[PDB]
Design a protein around this ligand. Structure first.
Ligand code: FAD
Ligand code: ZIR
Ligand code: NAG
Ligand code: NAG
Ligand code: NAG
Length: 498
């Protein structure tokens, strides 16, 4: 027997069971795993989400698991509800009125629907001359989606991840209750949801911190053949100064294996063919099996003197660095063009049919004390003699900017690196080889005693999830699961309680 509000959803054609609806909600960006749901919900308002969740909590013996599909950018089925209900979150922003993105009157924050995509949040913010401070590398992800993970890019060293830039949220819990939460009101829910992997409820609104919007970004790449010099410089650029950070707005890095050096440098979309030839020659002179590049930006406004001031600030910063003499490469773009840089890769890759392919990506957080060991064992070790398709990204993060009371798991050290090995599969023989190579990398780390944390991955064993969060932090995670999703129906694709 169905409650009136739940039956109303089916009657209005919002709760779909057809082949076309279930098939779209059964695959993800990973393109490795699949699971068909029993039903797909297309909510028109947040009231439709209250209906589904309150029914689930009131109905005894309710057998349907519920997932919240943002953009389905998940790698391993985290957004699926096998034989359950998939919420097509994007349907919340169908009606042009009322707007789902609203910049505050004071210009200090932006209210965004949980289903909203970061690219839309950027356009609506820029219209009011402001912008969020902390991003993801790719903008076609949802607010609620990135917030359930962490949300990291080159700005996270100084502003913390996206989870550290939220004032408050509207969350519909597993009980079906609409709860507004922050550090002052319902803090236990607020902390649980942020990096909470969709286990405690659905985010319908997030209040995101903004800053005055810069007009342009001076964008630089610095080349190294020495890992010690590369990592020391990334740490110098991101070091807290005697809370306070240096002049750089964004700091990331790239690893290039010698075998496909020329191809991979050309595929950055940054280097010219003249730059590529110089770097390839440098590699050969140094007899390097790997090349490294720091990617950094300096944000600046439309001011008349700004460009000349940027040249002097950049010259000063570069003078403190140890990249190979004369291997500094500069570009100058509009801020939105820099932020949306990755969308261009999606368009080109999809047209070649190389976007909707398996993505056995390896993403982890490695403590700073073990990064050189990771470089030897992985970049100069395991990965050598293999044909790599996709970028290899490495950059440091400051633990002081992460809130350990939140759900997201990080290493114990003050400095840790985001390590993102973004492999794209070329054939089924290549998929199995890549999946085995990831197991080998993790086995190498475990045997070397490297205390890493995975990011964007879902564990299949209970002992692995307990090690992920840490035993004490696991106890709080369970305490919160019992308070907000006692029936254990939310985001079953994480394989934590399902
Ligand atoms: C595909 C991709 C992903 C990606 C990226 C680049 C590409 C091409 N670059 C990233 C980066 O630079 N930094 C970063 O932190 N992450 C990056 N990612 C990964 C991305 O964060 C994840 O894929 C993430 O899941 C967000 O994607 P999406 O918005 O598409 O969400 P989902 O995959 O459908 O679901 C993720 C889990 O969260 C739950 N969920 C989703 N929305 C909500 C809301 N509103 N409230 C509560 N829970 C929610 C889903 O149930 C699922 O468990
Ligand atoms: C933590 C995670 C999952 C991060 C994922 N981010 C990215 N995902 C996919 N492609 C990327 C990413 N960053 C840069 N590129 C492309 O990589 C090259 C950058 O050198 C360019 O082609 C750029 O567009
Ligand atoms: C992967 O994508 C291809 C091409 O779009 C499709 O044939 C296949 O079903 C997908 N596999 C999974 C497991 O999602
Ligand atoms: C780099 O790769 C090329 C083949 O692309 C090879 O001729 C050269 O020996 C390699 N250098 C090192 C140092 O491994
Ligand atoms: C060049 O590097 C390769 C691989 O690291 C090694 O086999 C060789 O000893 C090096 N050659 C010289 C002349 O140092």
């Amino acid at each position: 027997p169905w409650p009136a509000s739940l039956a109303a959803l089916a009657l209005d054609g919002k709760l779909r069971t057809d082949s076309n609806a279930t098939a779209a909600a059964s695959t993800d960006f990973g393109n490795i795993t699949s699971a068909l749901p029993a039903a797909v919900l297309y909510p028109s308002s947040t009231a439709d989400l209250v209906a589904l969740l309150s029914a689930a909590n009131s109905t005894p013996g309710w057998p349907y698991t519920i997932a919240f599909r943002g953009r389905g950018h998940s790698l391993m089925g985290q957004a699926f509800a096998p034989g359950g209900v998939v919420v097509n979150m994007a349907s919340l922003g169908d009606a042009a009125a009322p707007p789902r993105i609203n910049v505050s009157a004071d210009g200090r924050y932006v209210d965004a629907g949980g289903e909203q995509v970061w690219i839309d949040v950027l356009r609506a913010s820029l219209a009011r001359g402001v912008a969020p401070r902390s991003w993801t590398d790719y903008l076609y992800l949802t607010v609620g989606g990135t917030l359930s993970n962490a949300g990291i890019s080159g700005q996270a060293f100084r502003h913390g991840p996206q989870i550290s830039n939220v004032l408050e949220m509207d969350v519909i819990t597993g009980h079906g209750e609409m709860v507004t939460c922050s550090k002052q009101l319902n803090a236990d829910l607020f902390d649980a949801v942020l990096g909470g992997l969709g286990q405690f409820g659905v985010i319908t609104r997030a209040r995101i911190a903004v800053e005055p919007a810069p007009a342009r970004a001076r964008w630089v790449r610095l080349v190294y053949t020495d890992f010690a010099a590369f990592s020391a410089d990334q740490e110098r650029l991101t070091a807290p100064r005697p809370a306070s950070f240096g002049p750089m707005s964004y700091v990331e890095g790239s690893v290039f294996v010698n075998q496909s050096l020329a191809t991979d440098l050309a595929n950055t979309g940054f280097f010219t063919d003249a730059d590529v030839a110089r770097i390839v020659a440098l590699a050969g002179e140094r007899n390097a099996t790997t090349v490294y590049s720091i990617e950094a930006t300096l944000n600046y406004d439309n001011a008349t003197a700004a460009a000349a001031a940027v040249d002097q600030e950049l010259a000063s910063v570069l003078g403190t660095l140890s990249y190979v003499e004369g291997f500094a490469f500069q570009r100058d773009v509009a801020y939105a063009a820099f932020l949306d840089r990755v969308h261009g890769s999606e368009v080109a890759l999809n047209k070649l049919g190389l976007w909707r392919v398996p993505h056995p990506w390896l993403n982890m957080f490695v403590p700073r004390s073990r990064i050189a060991d990771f470089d030897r064992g992985v970049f100069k070790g395991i990965l050598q003699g293999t044909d790599i398709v996709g970028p290899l990204i490495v950059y440091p993060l400051n633990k002081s900017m992460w809130d350990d009371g939140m759900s997201a798991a990080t290493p114990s050290e003050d400095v840790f690196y985001a390590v993102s090995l973004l492999f794209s599969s070329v054939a089924p023989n290549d998929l199995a080889r890549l999946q085995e190579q990831n197991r080998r990398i993790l086995r190498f780390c475990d045997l070397a005693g490297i205390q890493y944390k995975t990011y964007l991955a879902r564990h299949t064993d209970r002992s692995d999830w307990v090690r992920h969060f840490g035993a004490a932090k696991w106890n709080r995670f369970v305490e919160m699961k019992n308070k907000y999703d006692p029936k254990r129906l939310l985001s079953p694709g994480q394989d934590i309680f399902n």
